[PDB]
Design an enzyme around this catalytic site. Structure first.
Site, PDB file in Angstrom:
ATOM      1  N   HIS A   1       0.920  -1.240   0.045  1.00  0.00           N
ATOM      2  CA  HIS A   1      -0.145   0.004  -0.053  1.00  0.00           C
ATOM      3  C   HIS A   1       0.961   1.350  -0.170  1.00  0.00           C
ATOM      4  O   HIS A   1       0.212   2.298  -0.149  1.00  0.00           O
ATOM      5  CB  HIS A   1      -1.078  -0.015   0.869  1.00  0.00           C
ATOM      6  CG  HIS A   1      -0.652   0.216   2.486  1.00  0.00           C
ATOM      7  ND1 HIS A   1      -0.813  -0.801   3.444  1.00  0.00           N
ATOM      8  CD2 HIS A   1       0.017   1.042   2.959  1.00  0.00           C
ATOM      9  CE1 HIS A   1      -0.538  -0.193   4.645  1.00  0.00           C
ATOM     10  NE2 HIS A   1       0.252   0.820   4.303  1.00  0.00           N
TER      11      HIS A   1
ATOM     12  N   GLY B   1       2.205   6.227   9.500  1.00  0.00           N
ATOM     13  CA  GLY B   1       3.670   6.242   9.256  1.00  0.00           C
ATOM     14  C   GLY B   1       4.372   4.980   9.920  1.00  0.00           C
ATOM     15  O   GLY B   1       5.385   4.770   9.611  1.00  0.00           O
TER      16      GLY B   1
ATOM     17  N   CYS C   1       3.387   1.801   9.358  1.00  0.00           N
ATOM     18  CA  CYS C   1       3.210   0.617   8.555  1.00  0.00           C
ATOM     19  C   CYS C   1       4.705   0.028   8.080  1.00  0.00           C
ATOM     20  O   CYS C   1       5.371   1.177   7.919  1.00  0.00           O
ATOM     21  CB  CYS C   1       2.138   0.812   7.597  1.00  0.00           C
ATOM     22  SG  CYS C   1       0.559   0.440   7.927  1.00  0.00           S
TER      23      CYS C   1
HETATM   24  C1  LIG Z   1       0.032   1.897   9.208  1.00  0.00           C
HETATM   25  C2  LIG Z   1       0.268   3.337   8.400  1.00  0.00           C
HETATM   26  O1  LIG Z   1       1.362   3.907   8.564  1.00  0.00           O
HETATM   27  N1  LIG Z   1      -0.720   3.563   7.494  1.00  0.00           N
HETATM   28  C3  LIG Z   1      -0.508   4.909   6.350  1.00  0.00           C
HETATM   29  C4  LIG Z   1      -0.880   4.270   5.235  1.00  0.00           C
HETATM   30  N2  LIG Z   1      -2.230   4.095   5.178  1.00  0.00           N
HETATM   31  C5  LIG Z   1      -3.218   4.759   4.452  1.00  0.00           C
HETATM   32  O2  LIG Z   1      -4.423   4.774   4.958  1.00  0.00           O
HETATM   33  C6  LIG Z   1      -2.631   5.062   3.136  1.00  0.00           C
HETATM   34  C7  LIG Z   1      -2.127   4.431   2.292  1.00  0.00           C
HETATM   35  C8  LIG Z   1      -1.805   4.843   1.184  1.00  0.00           C
HETATM   36  C9  LIG Z   1      -2.214   6.436   1.136  1.00  0.00           C
HETATM   37  S1  LIG Z   1      -3.286   6.575   2.319  1.00  0.00           S
HETATM   38  C10 LIG Z   1      -2.488   2.768   6.019  1.00  0.00           C
HETATM   39  C11 LIG Z   1      -2.049   3.144   7.505  1.00  0.00           C
END
Ligand SMILES: *CC(=O)N1CCN(C(=O)c2cccs2)CC1
Ligand SMILES: *CC(=O)N1CCN(C(=O)c2cccs2)CC1
Lengths: 304, 304
Positions: free
Chosen positions: B41, B143, B145
């Site tokens: 992602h 952030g 992830c």
């Molecule tokens: C766990 C983490 O850092 N995230 C950030 C990314 N996320 C999103 O919602 C998006 C992915 C890409 C654009 S927005 C999941 C949680």
């Protein structure tokens, strides 16, 4: 989201842990620059520990009696001295992994990470607090002495604890890195009882703010209180008195949540008087007091 | 003595954490040998996350679109591929700090340490368990992830988790390092509810053994039970059924304490039926289920 009992990343401290052997006693030391810090009881026989005269015991020790091993490599001891309850072993090599560091003496209610070590080797990391009775509630087996407690501010390790003692009640006592015990404890196998383990009120309030930020809100009520009224209740429940300094420190969490500190005090007052009724707050059935307001802000903001 | 929720020392994993940026999305990656592992992602816009077609989105990405930074040094991406829900970014430099490592897929009830990271930088370490519903109860902000979960066996890091998802209920979902989600979760911003968060019975029993070893004994009673009788009670309280395999695994703790597993089951049965009555066990007011029998033995024996 989610709120966990979180330790600092231990790598910077892992790089500092060595084994110190004197005679048949092995424990841990902290290698910073060309000095290895360790508990002075490394020089004791179990016999010695009943009424040790450390200055007299130390006269029988030479540099070559202190065996300092970093991984599987021996360090050369070129000097030794006693500072309070720690030995400083001067070695001929600066620790190449020495981080930026400070020695700090923390106050009761301050939290820190422990890197539990055996034979200079890290076994685990966990979060502690300096209790109001100047004990900590650690996890320390024989050989863990010389394990250290620390905080990290970005790239600077602030060492605040070195493990020395287990009391007969299974709680822990140690020193700062200048070798001064927290509280009234001594490095002698004698009658040492801890005082009242009071709850760190400002930490509980911080953690109730953490709970609100993370969606746990069932304990918020329609009440407020005053510091004096709250403190009557604190006294009754062996909570530390809340001061205006504590209120000021909670200001940022007050701001972020929009819950006035004294309103959160009134929530805490009802929880004390009424209990949890079998409910939980951030996965706990009791009021958690080993998160500082600074810890809650750090973890809720993602500081590295 | 003392028993703490303890994480592995994080240094070996700290040495593997990098920042991965694709377009305006920044998260963490794991750099092992010349491969950087990260959640797929990273290629999504918040728009994309509602119904992402990852194969189609990936066609628009080139090696030079993946910005990989290790500290303040950029890594050159020479290849990229998708494996399940992770990207593998081939870089031109082997991580000089790569530890011995394995990728393992853990079972529900297995515990692991998380090194929470933001922008490739470690913020903290804590202990988790794979829940029976294949969620974990983490602490993860935007952030975080690409943060990983791991076990260490002496010098070998077994990576078991990479963080991908928060459910609307504030619990966490992720993958093994082959990019396969634990449980039924998908990397899509959709309706995903967790199943029953059942209690890991064998872990509670392990932790009751830990309590006895550490002097907390008030809950030991005059009763025994059978697996079938105990399991009637487990069912009622949303505890995992106890199997003979669980009994066998608890054998060493049985041996050390001299308390038969089924006697400890009968203690656990009374605690379920009667509650704690405002008492604590190893500083907890509820029955702790994120220590495995292996964890209890490790911490009680001082393994490094
Ligand atoms: C766990 C983490 O850092 N995230 C950030 C990314 N996320 C999103 O919602 C998006 C992915 C890409 C654009 S927005 C999941 C949680
Ligand atoms: C914390 C720790 O490792 N120890 C081991 C040393 N110790 C003693 O009882 C002895 C000191 C020297 C000889 S026996 C205190 C606890």
């Amino acid at each position: 989201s989610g709120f966990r009992k979180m330790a600092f990343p231990s790598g910077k401290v892992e790089g500092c842990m060595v084994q110190v052997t004197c005679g048949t006693t092995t424990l841990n030391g902290l290698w910073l620059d060309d000095v290895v810090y360790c508990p002075r009881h490394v020089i004791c026989t179990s016999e010695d520990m009943l009424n040790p005269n450390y200055e007299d015991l130390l006269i029988r020790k030479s540099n070559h009696n202190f065996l300092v091993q970093a991984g599987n490599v021996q360090l050369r001891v070129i000097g030794h001295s006693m500072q309070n309850c720690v030995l400083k072993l001067k070695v001929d090599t600066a620790n190449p992994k020495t981080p930026k560091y400070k020695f700090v003496r923390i106050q009761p209610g301050q939290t820190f990470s422990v890197l539990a070590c055996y034979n200079g080797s890290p076994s685990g990391v966990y979060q502690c607090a300096m209790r109001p009775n100047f004990t900590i509630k650690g996890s320390f087996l024989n050989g863990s002495c010389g394990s250290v407690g620390f905080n990290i501010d970005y790239d600077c390790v602030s060492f605040c604890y070195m493990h020395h003692m287990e009391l007969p009640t299974g709680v822990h006592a140690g020193t700062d890195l200048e070798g001064n015990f927290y509280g009234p404890f001594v490095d002698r196998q004698t009658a040492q009882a801890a005082g009242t383990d009071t709850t760190i009120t400002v930490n509980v309030l911080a953690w109730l703010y953490a709970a609100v930020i993370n969606g746990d809100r069932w304990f918020l009520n329609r009440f407020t209180t005053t510091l004096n009224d709250f403190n009557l209740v604190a006294m009754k429940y062996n909570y530390e008195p809340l001061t205006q300094d504590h209120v000021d420190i909670l200001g940022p969490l007050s701001a972020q949540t929009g819950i006035a500190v004294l309103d959160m005090c009134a929530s805490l007052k009802e929880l004390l008087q009424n209990g949890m009724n079998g409910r939980t707050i951030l996965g706990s059935a009791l009021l958690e007091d080993e998160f500082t307001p600074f810890d809650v802000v750090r973890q809720c903001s993602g500081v590295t």
